[PDB]
Design a protein around this nucleic acid. Structure first.
Lengths: 69, 366, 49, 49, 49, 74, 252, 151, 48, 251, 98
RNA sequence: UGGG
DNA sequence: GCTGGCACGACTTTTGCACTCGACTAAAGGGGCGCGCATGCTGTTGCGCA
DNA sequence: TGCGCAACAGCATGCGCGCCCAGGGCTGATCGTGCAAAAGTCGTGCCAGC
C-alpha cells in the first residue's frame, strides 16, 4: 500500500528524504545496511550517471567487470 | 511582505575576489611546469603589486633541479602582459616600461623620451629637471607632453581590490558639552539588554508545555537571565563610569592634553589597571572633534617640571615645523632650541625622530 | 470576534458515535479565557486557559 | 486608462489564446507611455582613520 | 516613545500605501483583515469562514 | 541539417545508441585527425555524424574495424 | 563593446546549436523539450503555437525557463529525444497531441461546408487545383457541390503506390484542401464537417501510415492554411448574435 | 522509480484474462482499446473450433486488432506485468508498447516515470468529491423491472 | 617536493556506501585537536 | 572536524526517542521508565545477586534509603546516566539470543511473536553488524567544521553568530562548570544538577525539537539543531537532490 | 535576465537565486523526473555536477569550451560532502569503499 | 503584498 | 662644530589562571495547533482451568 | 464458583502538507580581581656623518 513501500526498500540512502530521516538513520545505523548505489535517486544525489537510457549501456559494461574483478 | 523575522540567515557571503590572477593563469595555455612556476610567482605578489620580494629568492625557493631562470623569466614577462597592464616585476622601472609598451605605440614624443627617462636618470629627474634638460638634449617645453603623458601613466595595480571592509567605528561612546560644561552623557544605549531581560522575563512563563519544567526550564533560564543581564549591566556601568572619569579628568576643548598615568584613572575608581586598560582597548569615544578612548589616556612625564607628556608636544612640534623655514633651514636642532625656550626641556637629539614620525617630511625635507 | 459568551454545537462529531456535544466559551477583552465543555460521559467539565 | 478602437477578428493567426495585436499608430502617438523615478544615495561616514 | 514608535514603525497591519492610481489608495485605506494580534494567521481556520 | 533522425536510427534501431555512436564519431571528427566522407554544408560535425549514420557506412562494426586497424598498423 | 563582427560569429554559433525549453510547474515529461533557436528582434521569446497545448499554458505574459546544453553528447540527447518533431504521441492516451485548435478549427470548419444556391451552383472543371475561380472571383469558398476529377493513391500494393482518378461531388473549400493531402491518404477523409474530431483521427492515421515527417509537415501546412483562411473568414460576435427563444417566457 | 526494465524475453506462459467492462446497459469501454497492444498470451480461437488466428505471441496493431474486430471473439488472453516473474526488472516482451514511437520497447526504457507521472498528470482538473448531485434527490430506485435497449 | 597536486588524488573510485555506529577511539582517529574554552573570537584582537 | 570530551555520560537523544526505541526494549523495560529514571533521580540498582530486589528494580528514593539502611553493601545504584552504561555493559548478547530463541521455540502466541520477533531479529542483526552495545552513548562529541557555520560579519551588526553556534559554547560552558565543580569535592545535589543541565544541553544540541526547545532572547524561535540542519527542510530537497540552481536559465 | 556566469556562494559552492546579484533561477526535482522520463543521462549529468557543485568542473570545463574540446570530465559534488560532514557530527558513521 |  | 641615526634602560604597559555572584519575579502569555492517520500504553470487559 | 487470563477499546502522541518568479526595510553577549611576567614604548646618551 505504498505507505511502507519506500520505507521497506533495501537501500538506506533512498527514500530517506521521502519520509522521516530519524528512524531511517537509526535503523540503518544499527543494522549496518549497504546501499550498493543501485537506485536512481542515489546516483542522482551522488552525481554518478543514471543506470537507465543512454547510461544503461555504460553501466552494463562495467557490470560485467563487477563479478569478474 | 516583511516575512516576520526577515531572512536573517547565514547567507554565504559571495564577495571574496582578492586576487583573480589564479583564474587568469588557469586559462593560460601552459605545458607542464609553467603552471607550477606561475603558481609560485603569483603567491609572492604583494597586495600593492609593485615590488614583490626578489627574483633570485623565487628560483632559489623552487627546488630547481635544472629549469634555469631563462624559463621563469619568460613566465614573468609573459604574465606581466596578460596582467592588468602589469603586475610585480618590481624594480619600479618595469611597471612604467610595460604600461607604455601596449598603451599607444605612437604619439608625438612618446618612445623617444620614454626610453631614456625610463632607463636611467628617472629618480634624478623626479625632483626637478634643470640641468637634466641639457642631458636629454630636448629644448624647453618639448618634454611637457612627455612627462604629461607619464603622469597619466600611473600604485600600478590596486584597480580591482573590491574590499568592502571599510571598517567603521559607529556610535560606541559619546560625550556632550552644554550649559558651560562639556560633560559626556554617554550619548549606543540600545536598551536591548535592559529590554530583553524585561522581555525575557515574560518568556519564562510562556513554555506552555504542561510539564512545568520547574527544575530545568525555569531555574536555569532564570539563572541565564540574571547572568546575562547582570553582566551587561555591569559592563555598561563600568563603561559609563570610565567614560565619566576620563571625561571629567581631562578636557578636550582646552588647548593641549594632560598626561594620565594608567594608575591615576585606575586610582579614581580604585580598580586594577589591567581591568580598565583592557576596557579602553576596543572601546572608542565620539565627541564633536576628530572621530578613541586610548589616545586620550597617553601617559608621559614630559621630562620637565614646568608642565605635558608627548601628545601635546607632538602636536605642537608639528604645529611649529608646520610654518617655519622661510629660507631652507631644514633644521631640527633649531626647532629643539625654540621648543626648549618654552621650558619643555626637549633633548633636541631624539626630537627630530618624534617630529619626523607620522608623515612629517623631516628630516628628508632638506 | 467580540468578547462574550459563545454557545457552540461543535458539529457533534467527536467519538464517531453520533452524539451531540454542546460547549461554550466566555472570552473577556483581556485576561484568561474560560471554557465549558461536555464529555460523552454526560458530565460537565471546565477548561481554563 | 486610455480608450482605443477595437476590432474583433483573427488577423493572419497573429492573435492566439488571449494575446493581442497593436498598430504602430499607438506607438507614434506616444500613448501608453510612462515615467519612472529612481532614488540614488551615497553616504559619507567617519571611519577609524 | 519606544512603544508607540515601535507599533507605528513596525507591524503587520502598518505597511506602505500603494501610490499607483487614487483608487488603489482609497481601497488600500478601506480594507478588512482577519489577521492582527488576536488574529487568524493563515492555513488554519479556512473553510466555512 | 537533418530534422528527422528516424532514418539513421532505422538503420540499426535503438534510438539510445545513436547518441553513443554519433558521439564517438563526433569526437573523431570534432577533436581532429580525421575527415568527413560526405561534403559539408558548413554545418557542425554533429549533423555530419548524423548523416554519416544515415549513409549506412558508419556503425559500431565499422568503428571497430577502423580502431583495431589503425591500432594494429601502428 | 558589441562589435558587428561578434553578431556574425554569434550567428555562426547559434545556427544549429540546440536550446531546450521548460516551464516552471512541470508535470509530465513533455513539459520540457529541446528546440532550435532563431534570433529575433525583441525582449520576449516566440514559441510555436501548436506546441503550446503540450505545455497546457496560455499567453497572459507567463515567464519561462531556458537551458543551453553544453559539450556534445547532450546535444545528441536533445536532438535525438527532446525534439518535438521527433516525438508526437504522448505516452499516456496514445491519442496524438499538438493537434491544432483555436483558429485552425474555424478555418477548416468554415472551409468545409455546402449550401443551397448561392454562387455558381455546380460546374465541370478539372482539379485538384480549382484556383482560377475562388482565389480570383466567380465562386464562393463553401459553395456549389462542385464536381471535379481527382487522382487518388493506394498503398495496398507492397512498397509501391498506384494512382486512381475519378469524378466526385465536393465543395470548393474541400477540393482546395485536398491539394495539401500527400499521396496515399484516402479521399473520403477530407469530405466531413471537420469538428477537430476529423483532424484528430486524420493526423492519427496519417502518422500511423505515412510516418513522422509527412504528418509533421502536413500538420504544419494545416496550421498555415488554417490561420490563413481562418483569417479570411472574419467571424465576429455581437448582441444580435445571441437569440432568445420566443416561447421561453411563457414556459417560465 | 526502481524498475530498470533490463531483461528482454523472460519466456513465461502466465497471462491475464482480457474481457470488456460492459458495465450496466451502456458499455463504458469497448474491447478494441483493451486488446490493442501488449502481447497475446497462449492462442485465440474463432467460433469455429480448431482454428488458430495468431501464432502464439504477436504484435497487436490496426491490422491484427481489426481482424479481431471482424470476428465474434469477445475476449483475449494477454500477458502483462506482475506476470513477468523476472528478477530485478521487467521483461521487454511482458510490458510492450510504451506508445510514443510506434515500435516495440527497447532496453533502457523510462517505465515507472511514464507510469506514475502519466497517471499523476491528471487529478488537477478533477472535481474530487461529486457528492450531493444525487440526481433528482430521490433515494435509489423503487422499480426493480429490467428493460433492454436491443433484443 | 615539486609537481605535487592534492586535487588530483582527492578523486577515487567508491561504491556501496555503508552506515554504522561510531566508537570513541575512531572518533579520536578523526580528532586533530581539542577545544578547551567556550569562547570563539576576540572582538579587540579580531582573531580566533 | 574537532571534538569535545565530556568527562560524564549522556543519553544520546538521537536514540531512545527516535520512534520505538532500540534501547528500552533491548533491556526489556517500559520506555517511560528509562526515560524518567535515566538521569538525576530514582535509583536504578544494578547487580545485587545477594539482594532481594530485582536487577531491573525501579525503586524510588524511599526504597533507596531503605536499601541504604537495610541492605548497604551489594546494593549499587547510580542515579545519574552512568547506570545504563554499567547495566548495558554487563549485558550478554549470546545468552539472551539463545534464551529468546528457545523461549520463542517453546512458547508462541499472537502477541508473543511480535515482542519476541522484534527483539530476536534486532539482537541477531546486531551481533552480525559488529557494533558494541555500549557505543550508543557517546563519550566524545565531534564538532562541525568552521565553514559549515559561517559567521559572515556585517558592517552594521559587527560579527554575526549563527543560531547553532551558541549550542557549542553552551555545552562547553556547562561542561567547564561541571569539570571545575567536579574535582572541587562538593555535595551530590549540585553535581546531579550539573549532570542534568549538561544532559539537557547536549540533548538540545543534537535534537532541537521536543524536550526544552531552547529559545533565543533577541529573535525568539526554536532556532535549528543538527537534526533540522541536515539539508534544507530536513529532506535532501533544497541544497541537494535536484535542488541545485545549475546555470544558464530562462527568466 | 539570462545569467551566464555570476558570483558564487561560499557555502555549498552554488550560485544565487536573486536578480541583480544575478540569480540562476532554479532547477527542481520534477525536472530531474522528466529528464529521467526521457532517459538522457549526460544532459542531466552535466547539470547536476559540473554546472553547479563541481569546483574543478567550472575551470576545467570552461577551459575545454574556450579551446573547443567539449569534454565533460565529471567531478564530485561538494553538497554531498556537506551532507557527509553533517552526518559525521552525529554519532553515525558512513564511509566510502575502495 | 503581488504573478502564473 | 652641528645634525641625524642608533643603542640602552626604565617603567609602563600588556597578559594569563582565577572565581563570583544568586537572584527573583510575577506578570505574561498562548490560547482556537486547519487538520488525518498510524502506532503504542492501559484499563476494562469476557471467557477458561481448577 | 470465583478468580484468573486474554482480548479489545480508548487516549495520546508523532509525522505530513504542490511548484517556479522579486523586491524591500534590523537582527544577544559576555561576565571581571589580583598578581606576576613580559613586552613595548619613551627618553636619553652616544656615535657617526657631513
Amino acid at each position: 500500500g505504498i505507505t511502507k513501500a519506500s520505507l521497506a526498500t533495501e537501500s538506506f540512502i533512498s527514500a530517506a528524504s521521502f519520509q522521516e530521516t530519524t528512524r531511517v538513520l537509526t535503523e540503518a545505523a544499527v543494522a549496518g545496511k549497504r546501499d550498493e548505489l543501485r537506485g536512481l535517486k542515489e546516483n542522482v544525489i551522488v552525481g554518478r550517471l543514471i543506470p537507465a537510457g543512454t547510461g544503461y549501456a555504460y553501466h552494463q559494461d562495467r557490470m560485467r567487470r563487477r563479478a569478474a574483478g | 511582505y516583511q516575512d516576520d523575522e526577515l531572512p536573517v540567515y547565514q547567507g554565504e557571503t559571495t564577495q571574496t575576489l582578492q586576487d583573480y590572477l589564479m583564474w587568469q593563469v588557469e586559462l593560460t595555455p601552459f605545458t607542464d611546469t609553467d603552471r607550477a612556476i606561475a603558481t609560485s610567482i603569483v603567491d609572492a605578489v604583494d597586495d600593492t603589486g609593485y615590488l614583490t620580494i626578489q627574483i633570485e629568492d623565487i628560483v632559489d625557493s623552487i627546488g630547481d633541479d635544472e629549469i634555469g631562470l631563462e624559463e621563469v623569466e619568460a613566465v614573468l614577462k609573459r604574465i606581466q602582459r596578460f596582467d592588468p597592464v602589469g603586475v610585480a616585476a618590481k624594480d619600479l622601472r618595469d611597471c612604467l616600461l610595460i604600461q607604455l609598451s601596449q598603451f599607444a605605440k605612437e604619439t608625438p614624443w612618446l618612445e623617444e623620451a620614454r626610453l631614456i627617462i625610463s632607463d636611467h636618470l628617472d629618480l634624478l629627474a623626479n625632483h626637478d629637471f634643470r640641468t637634466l634638460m641639457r642631458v636629454t638634449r630636448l629644448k624647453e617645453e618639448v618634454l611637457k607632453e612627455a612627462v604629461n603623458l607619464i603622469q597619466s601613466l600611473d600604485x600600478x595595480x590596486x584597480x580591482x581590490x573590491x574590499x568592502x571592509x571599510x571598517x567603521x567605528x559607529x556610535x560606541x561612546x559619546x560625550x556632550x558639552x552644554x550649559x558651560x560644561x562639556x560633560x559626556x552623557x554617554x550619548x549606543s544605549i540600545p536598551r536591548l539588554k535592559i529590554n530583553q531581560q524585561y522581555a525575557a522575563m515574560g518568556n519564562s512563563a510562556r513554555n506552555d508545555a504542561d510539564g512545568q519544567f520547574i527544575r530545568s526550564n525555569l531555574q536555569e533560564a532564570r539563572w541565564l537571565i540574571k547572568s546575562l543581564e547582570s553582566a551587561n549591566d555591569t559592563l555598561l556601568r563600568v563603561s559609563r563610569c570610565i567614560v565619566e572619569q576620563q571625561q571629567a579628568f581631562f578636557e578636550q576643548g582646552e588647548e593641549y592634553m594632560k598626561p594620565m598615568v594608567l594608575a591615576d584613572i585606575a586610582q579614581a575608581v580604585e580598580m586594577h589597571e589591567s581591568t580598565i586598560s583592557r576596557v579602553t582597548t576596543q572601546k572608542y569615544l565620539h565627541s564633536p572633534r576628530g572621530i578613541x578612548x586610548x589616545x586620550x589616556x597617553x601617559x608621559x612625564x614630559x621630562x620637565x617640571x614646568x608642565x605635558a607628556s608627548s601628545t601635546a608636544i607632538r602636536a605642537l612640534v608639528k604645529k611649529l615645523i608646520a610654518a617655519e623655514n622661510p629660507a631652507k633651514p631644514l633644521s631640527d636642532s633649531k626647532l629643539t632650541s625654540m621648543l626648549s625656550e618654552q621650558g619643555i626641556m626637549v633633548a633636541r637629539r631624539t626630537v627630530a625622530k618624534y617630529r619626523e614620525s607620522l608623515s612629517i617630511p623631516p628630516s628628508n625635507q632638506r | 470576534r467580540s468578547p462574550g459568551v459563545f454557545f457552540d454545537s461543535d458539529k457533534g462529531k467527536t467519538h464517531s458515535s453520533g452524539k451531540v456535544l454542546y460547549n461554550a466559551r466566555i472570552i473577556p477583552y483581556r485576561g484568561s479565557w474560560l471554557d465549558f465543555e461536555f464529555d460523552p460521559k454526560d458530565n460537565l467539565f471546565v477548561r481554563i486557559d | 486608462g486610455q480608450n482605443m478602437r477595437v476590432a474583433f477578428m483573427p488577423w493572419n493567426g497573429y492573435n492566439f489564446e488571449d494575446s493581442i495585436l497593436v498598430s504602430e499608430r499607438v506607438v507614434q502617438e506616444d500613448r501608453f507611455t510612462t515615467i519612472h523615478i529612481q532614488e540614488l544615495a551615497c553616504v559619507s561616514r567617519d571611519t577609524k582613520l | 516613545s519606544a512603544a508607540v514608535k515601535e507599533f507605528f514603525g513596525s507591524s503587520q497591519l502598518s505597511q506602505f500605501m500603494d501610490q499607483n492610481n487614487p483608487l488603489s489608495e482609497i481601497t488600500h485605506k478601506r480594507r478588512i483583515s482577519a489577521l492582527g494580534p488576536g488574529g487568524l494567521t493563515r492555513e488554519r481556520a479556512g473553510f466555512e469562514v | 541539417a537533418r530534422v528527422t533522425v528516424q532514418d539513421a536510427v532505422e538503420k540499426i534501431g535503438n534510438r539510445f545508441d545513436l547518441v553513443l555512436v554519433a558521439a564517438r564519431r563526433a569526437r573523431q571528427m570534432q577533436v581532429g585527425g580525421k575527415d568527413p566522407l560526405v561534403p559539408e554544408e558548413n554545418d557542425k560535425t554533429t549533423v555530419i555524424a548524423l548523416r554519416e549514420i544515415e549513409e549506412g557506412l558508419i556503425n559500431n562494426q565499422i568503428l571497430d574495424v577502423r580502431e583495431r586497424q589503425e591500432q594494429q598498423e601502428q | 563593446r558589441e562589435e558587428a563582427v561578434v553578431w556574425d560569429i554569434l550567428d555562426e554559433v547559434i545556427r544549429e546549436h540546440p536550446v531546450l525549453l521548460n516551464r516552471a510547474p512541470t508535470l509530465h515529461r513533455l513539459g520540457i523539450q529541446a528546440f532550435e533557436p532563431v534570433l529575433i528582434e525583441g525582449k520576449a521569446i516566440q514559441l510555436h503555437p501548436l506546441v503550446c497545448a503540450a505545455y497546457n499554458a496560455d499567453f497572459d505574459g507567463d515567464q519561462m525557463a531556458v537551458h543551453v546544453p553544453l559539450t556534445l553528447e547532450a546535444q545528441l540527447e536533445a536532438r535525438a529525444l527532446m525534439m518535438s518533431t521527433n516525438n508526437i504521441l504522448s505516452p499516456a492516451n496514445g491519442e496524438p497531441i499538438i493537434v491544432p485548435s483555436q483558429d485552425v478549427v474555424l478555418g477548416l470548419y468554415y472551409m468545409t461546408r455546402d449550401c443551397v444556391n448561392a454562387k455558381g451552383e455546380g460546374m465541370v472543371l478539372t482539379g485538384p487545383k480549382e484556383a482560377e475561380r475562388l482565389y480570383r472571383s466567380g465562386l464562393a469558398s463553401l459553395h456549389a457541390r462542385v464536381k471535379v476529377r481527382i487522382t487518388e493513391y493506394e498503398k495496398d500494393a507492397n512498397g509501391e503506390l498506384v494512382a486512381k482518378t475519378s469524378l466526385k461531388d465536393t465543395t470548393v473549400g474541400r477540393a482546395i484542401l485536398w491539394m495539401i493531402v500527400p499521396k496515399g491518404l484516402p479521399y473520403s477523409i477530407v469530405n466531413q464537417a471537420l469538428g477537430k474530431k476529423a483532424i484528430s483521427k486524420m493526423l492519427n492515421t496519417c502518422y500511423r501510415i505515412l510516418g513522422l515527417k509527412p504528418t509533421v509537415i502536413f500538420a504544419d501546412q494545416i496550421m498555415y492554411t488554417g490561420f490563413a483562411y481562418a483569417a479570411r473568414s472574419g467571424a465576429s460576435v455581437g448582441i444580435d448574435d445571441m437569440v432568445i427563444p420566443e416561447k421561453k417566457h411563457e414556459i417560465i | 522509480q526502481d524498475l530498470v526494465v533490463t531483461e528482454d524475453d523472460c519466456g513465461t506462459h502466465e497471462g491475464i484474462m482480457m474481457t470488456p467492462v460492459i458495465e450496466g446497459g451502456d458499455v463504458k469501454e469497448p474491447l478494441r482499446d483493451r486488446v490493442l497492444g501488449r502481447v497475446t498470451a497462449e492462442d485465440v480461437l474463432k467460433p469455429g473450433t480448431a482454428d488458430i488466428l495468431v501464432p502464439r505471441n504477436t504484435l497487436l496493431h490496426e491490422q491484427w486488432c481489426d481482424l479481431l474486430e471482424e470476428n465474434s471473439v469477445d475476449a483475449v488472453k494477454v500477458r502483462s506485468v506482475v506476470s513477468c516473474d523476472t528478477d530485478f526488472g521487467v521483461c521487454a516482451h511482458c510490458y510492450g508498447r510504451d506508445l510514443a514511437r510506434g515500435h516495440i520497447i527497447n532496453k533502457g526504457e523510462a517505465i515507472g516515470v511514464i507510469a506514475a507521472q502519466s497517471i499523476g498528470e491528471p487529478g488537477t482538473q478533477l472535481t474530487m468529491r461529486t457528492f450531493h448531485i444525487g440526481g433528482a434527490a430521490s433515494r435509489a430506485a423503487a422499480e426493480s423491472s429490467i428493460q433492454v435497449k436491443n433484443k | 617536493l615539486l609537481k605535487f597536486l592534492k586535487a588530483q588524488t582527492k578523486t577515487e573510485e567508491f561504491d556501496a556506501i555503508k552506515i554504522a555506529l561510531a566508537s570513541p577511539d575512531m572518533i579520536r582517529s578523526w580528532s586533530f585537536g581539542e577545544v578547551k574554552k567556550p569562547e570563539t573570537i576576540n572582538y579587540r584582537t579580531f582573531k580566533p | 572536524m574537532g571534538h569535545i570530551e565530556l568527562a560524564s555520560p549522556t543519553a544520546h537523544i538521537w536514540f531512545l526517542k527516535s520512534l520505538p526505541s532500540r534501547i528500552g526494549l533491548l533491556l526489556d523495560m517500559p520506555l517511560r521508565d528509562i526515560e524518567r529514571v535515566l538521569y538525576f533521580e530514582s535509583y536504578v540498582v544494578i547487580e545485587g545477586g545477594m539482594t532481594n530486589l530485582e536487577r531491573q528494580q525501579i525503586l524510588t528514593e524511599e526504597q533507596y534509603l531503605d536499601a541504604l539502611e537495610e541492605f548497604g553493601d551489594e546494593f549499587d545504584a547510580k542515579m545519574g546516566a552512568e547506570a545504563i552504561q554499567a547495566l548495558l555493559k554487563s549485558m550478554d548478547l549470546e545468552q539472551e539470543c539463545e534464551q529468546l530463541r528457545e523461549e520463542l521455540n517453546e512458547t508462541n502466541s499472537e502477541t508473543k511473536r511480535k515482542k519476541l520477533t522484534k527483539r530476536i531479529k534486532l539482537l541477531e542483526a546486531f551481533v552480525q553488524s559488529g557494533n558494541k552495545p555500549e557505543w550508543m552513548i557517546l563519550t566524545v562529541l565531534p564538532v562541525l567544521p568552521p565553514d559549515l557555520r559561517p559567521l559572515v560579519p556585517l558592517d552594521g551588526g559587527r560579527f554575526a553568530t549563527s543560531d547553532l553556534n551558541d549550542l557549542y559554547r553552551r555545552v562547553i560552558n556547562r561542561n567547564n562548570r561541571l569539570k571545575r565543580l567536579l574535582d572541587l569535592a562538593a555535595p551530590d545535589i549540585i553535581v546531579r544538577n550539573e549532570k542534568r543541565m549538561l544532559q539537557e544541553a547536549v540533548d538540545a544540541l543534537l535534537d532541537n525539537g521536543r524536550r526544552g526547545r531552547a529559545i533565543t532572547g533577541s529573535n525568539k524561535r526554536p532556532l535549528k539543531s543538527l537534526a533540522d540542519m541536515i539539508k534544507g527542510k530536513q529532506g535532501r530537497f533544497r541544497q541537494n537532490l535536484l535542488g541545485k540552481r545549475v546555470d544558464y536559465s530562462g527568466r | 535576465h539570462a545569467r551566464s556566469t555570476g558570483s558564487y556562494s561560499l557555502v555549498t559552492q552554488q550560485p544565487l537565486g536573486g536578480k541583480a546579484q544575478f540569480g540562476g533561477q532554479r532547477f527542481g526535482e520534477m525536472e530531474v523526473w522528466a529528464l529521467e522520463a526521457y532517459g538522457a543521462a549526460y544532459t542531466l549529468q552535466e547539470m547536476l555536477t559540473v554546472k553547479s557543485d563541481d569546483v574543478n568542473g567550472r575551470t576545467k570545463m570552461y577551459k575545454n569550451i574556450v579551446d573547443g574540446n567539449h569534454q565533460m570530465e565529471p567531478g564530485m559534488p561538494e553538497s554531498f560532502n556537506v551532507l557527509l560532514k553533517e552526518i559525521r557530527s552525529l554519532g553515525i558513521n558512513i564511509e566510502l569503499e575502495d
